[PDB]
Amino acid sequence: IEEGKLVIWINGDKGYNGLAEVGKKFEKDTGIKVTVEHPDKLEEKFPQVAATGDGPDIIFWAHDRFGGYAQSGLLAEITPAAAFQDKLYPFTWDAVRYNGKLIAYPIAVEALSLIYNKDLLPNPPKTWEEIPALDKELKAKGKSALMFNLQEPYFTWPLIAADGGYAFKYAAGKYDIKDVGVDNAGAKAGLTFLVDLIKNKHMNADTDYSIAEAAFNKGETAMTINGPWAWSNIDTSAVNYGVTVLPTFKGQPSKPFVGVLSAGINAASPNKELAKEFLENYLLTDEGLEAVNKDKPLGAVALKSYEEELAKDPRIAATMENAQKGEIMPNIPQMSAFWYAVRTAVINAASGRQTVDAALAAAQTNAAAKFNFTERDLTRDVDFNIKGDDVIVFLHIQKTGGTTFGRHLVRNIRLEQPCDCKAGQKKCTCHRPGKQESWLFSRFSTGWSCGLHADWTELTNCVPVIMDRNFYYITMLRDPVSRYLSEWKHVQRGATWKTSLHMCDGRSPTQDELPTCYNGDDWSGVTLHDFMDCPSNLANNRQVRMLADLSLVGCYNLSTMNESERNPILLASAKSNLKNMAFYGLTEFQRKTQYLFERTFHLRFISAFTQINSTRAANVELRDDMRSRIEQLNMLDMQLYEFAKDLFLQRYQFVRQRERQEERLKRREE
Ligand SMILES: O=C(O)[C@H]1O[C@@H](Oc2ccc([N+](=O)[O-])cc2)[C@H](O)[C@@H](O)[C@@H]1O[C@H]1O[C@H](CO)[C@@H](O[C@@H]2O[C@H](C(=O)O)[C@@H](O[C@H]3O[C@H](CO)[C@@H](O[C@@H]4O[C@H](C(=O)O)[C@@H](O[C@H]5O[C@H](CO)[C@@H](O)[C@H](O)[C@H]5NS(=O)(=O)O)[C@H](O)[C@H]4O)[C@H](O)[C@H]3NS(=O)(=O)O)[C@H](O)[C@H]2O)[C@H](O)[C@H]1NS(=O)(=O)O
Numbered sequence: 259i260e261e262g263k264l265v266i267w268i269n270g271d272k273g274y275n276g277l278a279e280v281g282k283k284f285e286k287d288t289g290i291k292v293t294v295e296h297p298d299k300l301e302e303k304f305p306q307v308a309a310t311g312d313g314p315d316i317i318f319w320a321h322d323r324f325g326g327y328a329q330s331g332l333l334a335e336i337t338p339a340a341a342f343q344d345k346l347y348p349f350t351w352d353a354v355r356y357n358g359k360l361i362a363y364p365i366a367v368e369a370l371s372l373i374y375n376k377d378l379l380p381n382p383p384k385t386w387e388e389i390p391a392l393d394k395e396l397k398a399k400g401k402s403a404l405m406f407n408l409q410e411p412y413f414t415w416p417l418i419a420a421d422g423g424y425a426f427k428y429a430a431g432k433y434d435i436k437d438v439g440v441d442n443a444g445a446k447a448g449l450t451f452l453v454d455l456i457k458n459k460h461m462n463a464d465t466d467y468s469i470a471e472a473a474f475n476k477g478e479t480a481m482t483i484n485g486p487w488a489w490s491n492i493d494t495s496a497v498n499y500g501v502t503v504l505p506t507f508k509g510q511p512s513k514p515f516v517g518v519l520s521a522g523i524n525a526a527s528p529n530k531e532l533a534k535e536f537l538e539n540y541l542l543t544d545e546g547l548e549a550v551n552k553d554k555p556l557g558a559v560a561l562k563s564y565e566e567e568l569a570k571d572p573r574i575a576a577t578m579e580n581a582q583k584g585e586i587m588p589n590i591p592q593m594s595a596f597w598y599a600v601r602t603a604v605i606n607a608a609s610g611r612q613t614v615d616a617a618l619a620a621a622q623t624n625a626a627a628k629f630n631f632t633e634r635d636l637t638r639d640v641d642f643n644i645k646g647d648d649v650i651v652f653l654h655i656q657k658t659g660g661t662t663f664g665r666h667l668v669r670n671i672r673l674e675q676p677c678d679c680k681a682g683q684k685k686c687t688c689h690r691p692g693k694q695e696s697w698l699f700s701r702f703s704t705g706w707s708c709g710l711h712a713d714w715t716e717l718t719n720c721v722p723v724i725m726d727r728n729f730y731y732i733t734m735l736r737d738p739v740s741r742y743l744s745e746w747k748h749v750q751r752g753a754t755w756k757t758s759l760h761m762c763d764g765r766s767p768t769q770d771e772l773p774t775c776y777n778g779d780d781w782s783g784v785t786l787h788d789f790m791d792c793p794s795n796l797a798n799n800r801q802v803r804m805l806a807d808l809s810l811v812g813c814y815n816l817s818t819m820n821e822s823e824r825n826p827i828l829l830a831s832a833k834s835n836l837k838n839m840a841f842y843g844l845t846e847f848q849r850k851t852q853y854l855f856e857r858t859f860h861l862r863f864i865s866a867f868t869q870i871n872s873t874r875a876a877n878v879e880l881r882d883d884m885r886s887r888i889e890q891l892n893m894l895d896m897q898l899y900e901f902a903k904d905l906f907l908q909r910y911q912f913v914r915q916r917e918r919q920e921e922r923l924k925r926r927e928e
Pocket residue numbers: 656683684685701705706710752753754755756757
């Protein structure tokens with residue numbers, strides 16, 4: 259981000275040419291250039307790039323995205339004088355308050371309305387229920403009743419919410435992120451009506467923003483559902499149109515989620531005072547908002563003076579009527595997960611490929627960030643026969659506490675013939691009773707015989723050969739930010755693991771495939787910033803990479819497929835291989851790890867595992883923005899760990915409760 263300049267991001271459906279005009283006046287008065295951009299998916303790109311040193315100085319979006327940004331430390335707190343604050347409606351400052359603090363400037367209130375062509379339909383329907391009959395009449399004239407974007411849940415939510423659907427329940431002063439209302443009777447009724455419209459061929463499941471707009475603006479459909487920004491193109495096409503209240507469903511109003519277009523300032527911006535000057539003294543004025551509004555209408559603006567001037571517009575009046583009937587959007591971080599979940603459910607239900615009940619049940623799970631596991635997933639029962647051909651394989655991922663765990667395996671298990679660990683020697687002899695065969699494949703028993711820190715790909719291709727059986731794979735996982743910091747500190751003190759083979763499809767990677775991050779013999783002394791800056795850093799997503807079948811993505815050759823394709827494959831492969839292992843533990847749960855290992859393999863340790871909280875990672879002082887960038891560099895590991903933690907904890911509770919019930923039965927039979 260260049261100092262002395264302003265870079266602004268705003269969505270492509272807003273008045274970015276008018277905003278540019280405000281930017282030109284600012285430049286006239288100050289010599290500060292203002293660049294407006296409208297990149298695609300700006301609301302996903304921003305948390306990826308703000309967490310580094312790129313991104314815009316100012317980001318525009320509806321307020322629902324901003325709590326997530328704020329929780330990640332990506333936004334400067336805004337500090338407007340009480341004088342300026344009173345120039346805007348308090349209603350709209352509420353939309354941009356997060357954990358007590360103001361994190362953006364509110365701009366305008368947006369709500370969806372029903373838009374109709376007065377030359378085809380001078381009185382629009384009051385109910386969703388009468389739309390099928392209307393469409394039948396219109397189809398005989400070569401036209402349709404209604405087309406609107408069915409791909410974005412923003413547009414279908416008003417009907418889904420009408421009879422009772424909700425996102426997160428509000429109770430006791432906060433949003434309950436476990437109480438999700440996307441599969442209740444009301445939500446199901448709303449979505450069923452929409453699905454029936456499609457089944458009865460009054461709408462098409464493929465209709466998106468462009469198709470609906472094109473049809474309405476060409477007079478092919480009598481109605482659409484859209485927001486104030488859409489009015490400009492309708493005027494461009496010279497359609498004679500009205501804007502009115504959304505139809506009712508089962509006698510209740512459609513309930514649009516209400517958005518406040520808001521302007522946040524990047525916490526990494528070196529131009530924060532200029533951003534505040536632009537927003538307060540140029541944009542949030544009658545003149546500035548008029549420039550934007552004349553390009554694409556904002557709706558009901560937040561500035562009291564200019565809102566009063568436009569309030570007579572019946573299109574805005576209709577916008578306010580639908581907004582009062584709807585709900586202000588929560589700004590909490592979980593909003594994005596809600597939207598993603600509903601987006602997928604509506605698409606699959608509307609397509610007919612899944613019923614409403616099944617699709618909304620899946621959305622409920624995803625919106626509440628839950629994991630459903632089968633009994634088989636929670637049951638890991640290994641009749642481990644050390645005298646037989648069973649072999650335990652410990653896959654050690656760097657910096658997951660594998661030294662501690664590996665030492666437990668060779669020093670701390672109660673066995674008739676335990677591992678023979680000679681004093682002052684690194685490895686131990688872990689042989690079956692009376693044989694020269696090992697029962698444990700591990701760093702401290704067999705050594706690195708399949709490669710230094712051999713991963714799932716290397717071990718599954720090498721272990722069966724280098725031992726000739728039942729192989730029981732186990733590993734440890736650690737929360738990725740701590741694991742990444744631990745690896746940074748270890749590399750900073752000389753670790754390279756440069757002799758790892760990284761074998762996959764029968765060869766090690768090429769230097770072009772896997773460039774070294776450092777000059778010389780190691781990367782000692784590296785700062786956290788330079789560590790994070792190397793694109794080929796093997797610390798990034800190490801746990802997913804080392805648990806996945808890397809053949810599935812062309813081994814280490816990043817040109818074989820795109821990231822959008824490689825990333826979901828790696829994650830699903832890692833989740834599957836982890837889940838289907840005999841056992842895994844988590845570094846942060848040493849006692850539960852011990853207990854589950856014991857109950858999985860029917861073994862007992864001599865001395866209790868212990869939790870060490872004062873790790874080198876814990877000692878790193880981590881700003882929130884920097885934690886967020888580490889999460890972004892490790893986004894696959896973040897997802898894997900969330901999955902693994904929940905499975906691990908459900909396994910612990912399952913095994914404990916079974917064991918507690920067995921003890922009781924013993925008592926109740928004596
Ligand atoms: O045998 C020969 O060929 C020798 O022949 C001699 O000449 C003659 C001639 C004639 C006769 N005669 O009788 O007539 C005899 C001999 C030559 O003079 C001589 O050159 C030649 O020697 C070669 O062959 C030797 C036998 O193989 C060999 O010596 C062995 O070396 C092994 C080795 O270095 O690998 C050694 O193994 C032990 O030490 C290793 C090094 O420490 C261990 O491996 C390391 O393990 C680390 C670990 O797990 O902690 C790992 O560290 C990394 O990961 C950890 C965990 O994440 C992290 O904490 C660390 O920070 C991280 N470090 S890193 O730098 O970032 O990687 C290391 O990476 C890994 O290297 C190993 O586990 C030990 N095994 S053991 O316990 O079983 O011993 C072995 O013991 C030696 O015997 C020589 O190396 C050969 N020399 S060469 O010139 O040919 O190369």
